[PDB]
């Protein structure tokens, strides 16, 4: 609902698409967070009840994509520094920030309840 635009061509066929995968990447990630925690609820569960030449390379494969993740996280989090700065620049007081923020999280809860209207 916050997207405006009317023609612009195939770009709306691109930007309404890229919003999907954004509003769907947080779905796979939070519904995987609810999965990983439970392993500990089974791991911590266990205590009250392999190969070393490849244990490393099955974690080095996971360590590497944690080097690129951290690097990617930061250079992007600074991409929000200036562009939030220029907004607090081009605006001055009562944040349009927290409004569009608390607006977007509101669609989610609708989008997390309207889906249930269709589950029922």
């Amino acid at each position: 609902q916050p997207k405006m635009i009317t023609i612009s061509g195939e770009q709306l066929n691109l930007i309404t698409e890229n919003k999907e995968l954004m509003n769907e990447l947080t779905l796979v990630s939070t519904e995987l967070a609810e999965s990983i925690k439970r392993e500990t609820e089974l791991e911590e569960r266990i205590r009250l009840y392999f190969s070393d030449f490849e244990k490393e390379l099955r974690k080095k494969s996971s360590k590497i994509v944690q080097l690129i993740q951290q690097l990617n996280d930061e250079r992007l989090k600074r991409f929000i520094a200036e562009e939030q700065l220029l907004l607090q620049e081009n605006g001055t007081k009562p944040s349009s920030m927290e409004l569009v923020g608390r607006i977007e999280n509101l669609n989610k809860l609708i989008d997390e309840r309207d889906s249930e209207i269709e589950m029922l």
Binding site: D52, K55, E56, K59, K60, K63, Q66, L67, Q70, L71, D73, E74, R75, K77, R78, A81, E82, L85, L86, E89
Partner: protein
């Protein structure tokens, strides 16, 4: 033992991810303060 060699793996790796978290927070700090002052320059 071998379990002592096991920690000698993950911690040998857990060092090398901090070492590039530490880097990436310099990469912002450096490029950040010269962005704050770039506002005043374009102000």
């Amino acid at each position: 033992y071998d379990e002592i060699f096991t920690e000698n793996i993950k911690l040998k790796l857990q060092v090398q991810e901090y070492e590039t978290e530490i880097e990436s927070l310099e990469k912002v700090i450096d490029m950040l303060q010269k962005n704050r002052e770039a506002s005043l320059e374009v102000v």
